[PDB]
């Protein structure tokens, strides 16, 4: 009947379908971000809890080592000193062994989060490109339809529908841009904390190895003296 109205129905129905797919993508992104937030924060709490216990333990190891050193400097029987050294070395060995298992588990959990975050960054960047292209095509089609209504004015239904199509498209683009800024802000904050906490874990692994090496050096010197 009215060919220009047929053109409007086609664009409106296609647009409404496209908006639904974008809505679903945003809801999915928000859910994935919430999961990453929870996991990042749990992993951070697990690392800080471990560091606090480790600091306490190393203080006690150093104190016991220095007490033994002072007893050697003062000159006591070797039997009692050897027994105390063997007990300390066994205590350090059990602390070392259990710690290795904890550190493996933490490293795996942290890398799982890093991998998921990189995947979501990739996914959302791909979606951004896709949506930009879809939106550009709609903008092109909508602007082209103006040319068929030059002889129309306010009150005419076709003219009103064209204004509505434009107004709704423009409002959607504004909301999509808001969503894009929020996605980018969240991903960047996650990336910063994940990187800082990865560096913290790597520093912890290195400092533990250094500390255990120094403890072994001192203990081996003590044992060499007990003769």
């Amino acid at each position: 009947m009215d060919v220009l109205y047929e053109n409007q129905k086609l664009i409106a129905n296609k647009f409404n379908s496209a908006i639904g797919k974008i809505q679903d993508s945003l809801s999915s992104t928000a859910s994935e971000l919430g999961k990453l937030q929870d996991e990042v924060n749990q992993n951070a709490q697990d690392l800080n809890t471990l560091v606090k216990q480790l600091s306490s333990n190393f203080g006690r190891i150093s104190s016991e080592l220095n007490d033994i050193l002072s007893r050697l400097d003062k000159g006591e029987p070797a039997k009692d000193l050897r027994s105390d050294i063997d007990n300390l070395e066994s205590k350090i060995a059990g602390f070392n062994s259990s710690l290795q298992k904890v550190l493996t588990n933490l490293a795996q959990k942290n890398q799982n989060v890093e991998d998921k975050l990189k995947g979501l960054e990739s996914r959302t960047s791909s979606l951004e490109k896709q949506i930009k292209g879809i939106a550009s095509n709609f903008q092109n089609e909508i602007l082209k339809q103006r040319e068929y209504l030059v002889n129309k004015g306010s009150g005419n239904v076709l003219y009103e529908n064209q204004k509505l199509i434009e107004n709704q498209f423009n409002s959607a683009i504004g909301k999509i841009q808001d969503s894009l800024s929020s996605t980018k802000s969240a991903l960047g904050k996650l990336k910063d904390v994940v990187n800082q906490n990865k560096q913290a874990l790597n520093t912890l692994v290195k400092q533990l190895s250094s500390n255990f090496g120094a403890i072994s050096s001192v203990l081996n010197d003590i044992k060499s003296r007990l003769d």
């Binding site: 009215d2 809801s27 990042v40 802000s185 120094a214």
Partner: protein, 40 residues
């Protein structure tokens, strides 16, 4: 022996709830951008 203080190692927490909330809100708000044409 003084092994230092391993407490200098610290993991940070993240807070992106504002952004998550805004994404969910915009997803809902897009319903107001759907086109309901007038009949010719």
């Amino acid at each position: 022996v003084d092994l230092g203080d391993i407490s200098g190692i610290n993991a940070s927490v993240v807070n992106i709830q504002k952004e998550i909330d805004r994404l969910n809100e915009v997803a809902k708000n897009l319903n107001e951008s759907l086109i309901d044409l007038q009949e010719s």
